[PDB]
Amino acid sequence: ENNAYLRDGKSNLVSKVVELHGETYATTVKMGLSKTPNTATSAKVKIDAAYLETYNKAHNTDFALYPQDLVTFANEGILTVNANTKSAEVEMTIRAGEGLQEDKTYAIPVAISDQSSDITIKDEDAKHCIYLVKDMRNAGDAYKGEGVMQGYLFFEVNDVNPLNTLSFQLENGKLLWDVVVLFAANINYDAEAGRPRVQCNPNVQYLLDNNETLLQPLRRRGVKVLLGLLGNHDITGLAQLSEQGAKDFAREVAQYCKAYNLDGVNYDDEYSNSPDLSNPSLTNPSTAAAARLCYETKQAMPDKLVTVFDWGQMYGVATVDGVDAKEWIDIVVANYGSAAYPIGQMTKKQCSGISMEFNLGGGGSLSASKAQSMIDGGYGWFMGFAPSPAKYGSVFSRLQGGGEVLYGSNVAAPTIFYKKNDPTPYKYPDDL
Ligand SMILES: CC(=O)N[C@@H]1[C@@H](O)[C@H](O[C@@H]2O[C@H](CO[C@H]3O[C@H](CO[C@H]4O[C@H](CO)[C@@H](O)[C@H](O)[C@@H]4O)[C@@H](O)[C@H](O[C@H]4O[C@H](CO)[C@@H](O)[C@H](O)[C@@H]4O)[C@@H]3O)[C@@H](O)[C@H](O[C@H]3O[C@H](CO)[C@@H](O)[C@H](O)[C@@H]3O[C@@H]3O[C@H](CO)[C@@H](O[C@@H]4O[C@H](CO)[C@H](O)[C@H](O)[C@H]4O)[C@H](O)[C@H]3NC(C)=O)[C@@H]2O)[C@@H](CO)O[C@H]1O
C-alpha cells in the first residue's frame, strides 16, 4: 500500500488561504507518497467543483467556487514524479478575476485524478486539497510586500479605539500593524444552555454592533481584525473544554467572526478557574484541550486566522486527530521579553520575534538591530500590546529604526488619534 495525499506545495498545507496582491498567484500542487514510487507511477490533478458542496457541508461554510477559467495547471494537470522525494507536483496559477464581489472567499477544490493502481487514496480527505482565495488587490495599505515581517497588535478595547491602528504608518504611507486584536471577548458559563458561551462586555459589544464604523475601515485598508477571547473567572476556559465543548464553542466563535465580518480569533488562556469535571463540556485543563479548541475553530472558519498567545496551557501540543498544528495555528505570539517558537511542522514565519507591552513598558523595542536579528532568525511577526494615544510618545520611540530595516521606510511620528467609540480623526497631539 503506497498512500498518497494532496497538499499545496509551497505551504505544505492541505487547506491554504491565498491572498491575491497582484494579477497572478503561482504555487504547486503536491502529491506525497508513503513509499518510493516505481517508473510507472503517475497521477493528474483537476478542479473538483462537485466536492465543494461536500466541503461546505462538512465545515458549515458557504464558499463560492472560484471561476475555474481563472485557474490553470501546467502540463495538463499531470504530476511530475520525483521518486527521490516520494512526491509528485504540478505548477498551478491563480489569476485575479474581473467582477468578483469583494471581501469574499472563493474556493478551488483540487482532486487527485487518474492515479496509477499502485497508489492508494484512503479517503476523500486524502484525495483533495483546497485553496481559499481572497482578492486583496484594493486593500493593500497594510501590505508591505512579500517576505517581510508583519505586525500583530492587541487593543485593550475597554479603553482604546482600534481605529488608532491608523495612527501607525510608515513614511511611505503603509500601515504598520497587519493584524490587530480586540482584547477581549470572554468565555463564560451559560447556565440556561448548559455550556460555555462567548460573553462580551459592553465595550466589546459596542465595537461589534458598530463594526461598520469602528472596525471595517481597518479591513478596507488590509488590516485583519481578530476577536480576542480570554478566560473570565468561572469554570470555563480555553484550555479546559471537552472535545464536544470545544466543537460547540468553536462554532460560536466562527459565528461571531461571520456575523461581525471579522478575520479570526486570538485565544488567551488566562484568568479561568478550575472546571467542573462533572460537566460534559469541560475537561481537565491541558494543552491538549487547548489544541483541540484551536483545531475545531480552524475547522469552523478555515478561511480565517486561528492565533494564540503562548501562555497558560494554550500552546504546545502539535497534533489533533492526526492533523499537524501548521494547519490550525496561523500565528503564535509569545509573552513579553521572548520569541515564540514553532511546533509540529510550523515554521518561525508563524512566530513573533518580539512582544512589546506598550502600556507597562516591558519586552524591548523594534530597533534596527532587533529587526535585523528577527529577520535573521526567520521570524514572521512582531507583537505589541495595549498602545494608547496618551502613551504615543513612549510607544513610537519603541518603534524607531526598525521600519527602515524591515521595510525600507521608518515608522512616521503620529499625526492622528481616535477617542473611545468615536470615529472622528483627531489631531495628535493637539486634540489630546
Ligand atoms: C496577551 C496579554 O497581554 N495577556 C495578559 C493580559 O491579560 C494582561 O492585562 C492585564 O490584565 C489584568 C488582569 O485582568 C483580568 O483580571 C481583571 C481583574 O479581575 C478581578 O477583579 C474584578 C473586580 O475588579 C473581578 O470582577 C474579577 O472576577 C477578578 O476577581 C479583570 O478586570 C480583567 O477583565 C476585564 O478586562 C478584560 C480584558 O483585559 C476583559 O476581557 C474582561 O471582560 C474585563 O472587562 C481580566 O479578567 C488587568 O487588571 C490589567 O488592566 C489594567 O491595564 C489595562 C491595560 O492593559 C487597562 O485597560 C485596565 O483599565 C487596567 O488599568 C488600570 O485601570 C485603573 C482604572 O482606570 C487605573 O487606576 C487609576 O490609577 C491611578 C494611578 O495609577 C489613580 O489611582 C486613579 O484614581 C485610578 O483610577 C490603573 O492605574 C490602571 N493600571 C494600569 C497598570 O494601567 C490588564 O488588562 C497583560 C499585562 O501586561 O498581559 C498579559 O498578562
Author numbering: 45 to 476
Task: Show passages lifted from the paper.
ENGases are endoglycosidases that hydrolyze the β(1,4) linkage between the first two GlcNAc residues of N-linked glycans on proteins. To this end, we focus on two GH18 enzymes, EndoS2 from S. pyogenes and EndoBT-3987 from Bacteroides thetaiotaomicron, a key enzyme that catalyzes the first step in the degradation and processing of mammalian HM-type N-glycans in the human gut. EndoBT-3987 is composed of two domains: the N-terminal β-sandwich domain (residues 42–179) and the C-terminal glycoside hydrolase domain, which adopts an (α/β)8-barrel topology typical of GH18 family enzymes (residues 194–476). D312 stabilizes the reaction intermediate by hydrogen bond interaction and orients the oxygen of the 2-acetamide group of GlcNAc (−1) in order to attack the anomeric carbon, forming the oxazoline intermediate, whereas E314 acts as an acid/base, protonating the anomeric carbon in this first step and in a second step deprotonating a water molecule that produces the second nucleophilic attack.
Here we present the X-ray crystal structure of the ENGase EndoBT-3987 from Bacteroides thetaiotaomicron in complex with a hybrid-type glycan product. We unambiguously identified the Hy-type N-glycan product in the electron density map, located at the center of the glycoside hydrolase domain in a shallow pocket decorated by the connecting loops β10–α2 (loop 1; residues 201–205), β11–α3 (loop 2; residues 228–245), β14–α4 (loop 3; residues 275–286), β15–α5 (loop 4; residues 313–330), β16–β17 (loop 5; residues 355–374), β17–β18 (loop 6; residues 379–395), β18–α6 (loop 7; residues 402–411), and β19–α7 (loop 8; residues 430–432). In the EndoBT-3987WT-Hy product crystal structure, all the sugar residues are in the energetically favorable chair conformation 4C1 but GlcNAc (−1) residue is in skew boat conformation (1S3) stabilized by interactions with protein residues. The nitrogen and oxygen atoms of the acetamide group of GlcNAc (−1) make hydrogen bonds with the side chains of Y380 and D312, respectively. The base of the binding site is mainly composed of a set of aromatic hydrophobic residues, including F198, F227, F353, and F429, located at the top of the corresponding β10, β11, β16, and β19 β-strands of the barrel, respectively. The α(1,6) antenna (Manα1–6(Manα1–3)Manα1–6) interacts with loops 1, 2, 3, and 4, whereas the α(1,3) antenna (Galβ1–4GlcNAcβ1–2Manα1–3) is largely solvent exposed and interacts with loops 1 and 7 of EndoBT-3987, mainly through Man (−6) and GlcNAc (−7) residues. Man (−5) is completely buried into the binding site. The O2 and O6 atoms of Man (−5) make hydrogen bonds with the side chains of N202 and E200, respectively. In contrast, the interaction of EndoBT-3987 with Hy-type N-glycans is driven by the α(1,6) antenna.
